[PDB]
Amino acid sequence: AMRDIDSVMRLAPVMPVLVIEDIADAKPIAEALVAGGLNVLEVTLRTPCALEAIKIMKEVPGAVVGAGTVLNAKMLDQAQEAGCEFFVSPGLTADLGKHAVAQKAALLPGVANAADVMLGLDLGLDRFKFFPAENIGGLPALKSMASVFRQVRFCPTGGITPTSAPKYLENPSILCVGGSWVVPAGKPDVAKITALAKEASAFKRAAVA
Amino acid sequence: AMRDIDSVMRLAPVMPVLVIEDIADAKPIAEALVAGGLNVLEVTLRTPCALEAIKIMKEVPGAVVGAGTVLNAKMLDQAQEAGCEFFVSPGLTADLGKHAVAQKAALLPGVANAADVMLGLDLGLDRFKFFPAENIGGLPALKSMASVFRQVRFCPTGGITPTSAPKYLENPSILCVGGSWVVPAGKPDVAKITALAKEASAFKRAAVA
Amino acid sequence: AMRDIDSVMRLAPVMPVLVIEDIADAKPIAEALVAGGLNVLEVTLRTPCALEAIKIMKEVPGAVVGAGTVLNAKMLDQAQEAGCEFFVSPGLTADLGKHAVAQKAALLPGVANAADVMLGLDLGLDRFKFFPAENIGGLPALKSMASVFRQVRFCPTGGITPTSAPKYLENPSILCVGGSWVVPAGKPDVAKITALAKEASAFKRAAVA
């Protein structure tokens, strides 16, 4: 079912993009985000501990944990074995997309141009990250792409801010945005993380009442 | 013959990009454009009626009707069966390009970066839309690409305006531009459409005397 | 050994991108660059004489000559037969990358977005040109990409200037930059070329002491 990732995208306005450099912060970070209503969590596989951080965050009730920076079929298998509910990649290859479809994995691949979208449509996928959004033309570029691909829906990620997120979310083709601002670099301050998540959780979306 | 699409690109300075939301406007729009000298028409397959609009516009003498937003081999077959003389896509996949070559279809695929051009060259194609032009660096980005791919020629599309079109057309590597400004959104005003087409038809081109 | 191209990238801060329109300038240009310490030379295959210019520049002691604008496996074979030590392409296709790996060719393919990097990683490559850098978001776009692909290292090329080159070179993920400014258009002035190469040779790099 390719509808799975579409449902996940509509659960929350903002999907935190987590880079967990200290594994001891994994549980407090997931707890603070879930407490703010941003329970759909992308744990990027950019760090040595990341699979163990995914297993820790899965222990938080209500956390919907996915793996990010899934670059190939082997990383998808390792993430799926760790119990990830969805998978995010910066871009799309035919090998990754065919493996995710064969494995029934809810993949949310990044796209930057029309050729990336067309490859995903050929694989049966029609939901994508627009990444890195602010470096590939931003909202005006996403609007031109959404105008061409009427059945596709998007999650812009890359340079999104609390100021620009509602502007992206006004577009009916945008289901959510990705961002790292909800977890500031440095030692986690769970009260500030929860407050930023509560604010992002309240963002209005044209696509989701 | 891969030369077919190159000839089509040189016929008119501007190729209208048509989004026909009301099929009753198809004939008056094609008639007004042809009367202005912009007879090379891209009817995007973004709307339910679009194949029927293509059949209507083919009835206009002098209209050279193509299909746009051709995303896959099946859409190309449906457009070719409707009698389209050429085919436009926002991007290029190997499956679409190999099918167009096998079917002898005059395809004008979009490209946004060097990898897209190299895939097209591998398929035997050397004429592309540069799309969406104004969101992927515009004329300066197209100049860098044309400097690298000396044998390739381009049709920038996406954000082109009557003001910027001559500036793109000064570049000898650019054969034409694509635009939607010639048909304003709303109920067609055939006198205004014809006047805008006559102005675009007069645009000077370094590549075409 | 995929480490070969990484070693080549660290040899000099700047890799001249040479477009040799007059073959008689090939030897004086290579001699002037090597005398300035920019001995890693990319001779683009954009000109009819380019393979003969590569053979001429190989005669200069200390010149490490590569071919640029290598668009397909056949051009790589012609360059490798001419004795090129490395190979540069504006973008990457699976056919070009698989051929370079099979032929043990030190390929430095261009990338513009995450899908291009992921294809290269799938082929066993992790060193790329970021091209054309200043038209695809520049340093901010390269920073977002280097943040995602922690094991990848880059050579930005396209619009780099003596002013911006040190700013790119401050990033530890950047090993070198590509540029054409060291050889100004027109008849070569070997004293000016050597002076510009000596200045670029002195550029500081976070990645290379």
Curated annotation (Swiss-Prot), chains A, B, C:
It catalyses: 2-dehydro-3-deoxy-6-phospho-D-gluconate = D-glyceraldehyde 3-phosphate + pyruvate. Induction: The eda gene is monocistronic and is transcribed from a single promoter. High-level expression of the gene can be attributed to very efficient translational initiation caused by the high quality of the ribosome-binding site and stability of the mRNA. One of its GO terms (molecular function) is (R,S)-4-hydroxy-2-oxoglutarate aldolase activity. Keywords: Carbohydrate metabolism, Cytoplasm, Lyase, Schiff base. GO terms for cellular component: cytoplasm. It comes from the Bacteria. The active site is at 42 (proton acceptor), 129 (schiff-base intermediate with substrate). CDD domains: KDPG_aldolase. The record marks 157 as: Plays a major role in determining the stereoselectivity. Its EC number is 4.1.2.14. It is found in: Cytoplasm. The keyword Hydrolase does not apply. Pyruvate binds at residues 46, 69, 129. Pathway: Carbohydrate acid metabolism; 2-dehydro-3-deoxy-D-gluconate degradation; D-glyceraldehyde 3-phosphate and pyruvate from 2-dehydro-3-deoxy-D-gluconate: step 2/2. Involved in the degradation of glucose via the Entner-Doudoroff pathway. Catalyzes the reversible, stereospecific retro-aldol cleavage of 2-keto-3-deoxy-6-phosphogluconate (KDPG) to pyruvate and D-glyceraldehyde-3-phosphate. Belongs to the KHG/KDPG aldolase family. PANTHER family: 2-DEHYDRO-3-DEOXY-6-PHOSPHOGALACTONATE ALDOLASE-RELATED, 2-KETO-3-DEOXY-6-PHOSPHOGLUCONATE ALDOLASE. Homotrimer. This is 2-dehydro-3-deoxy-phosphogluconate aldolase.
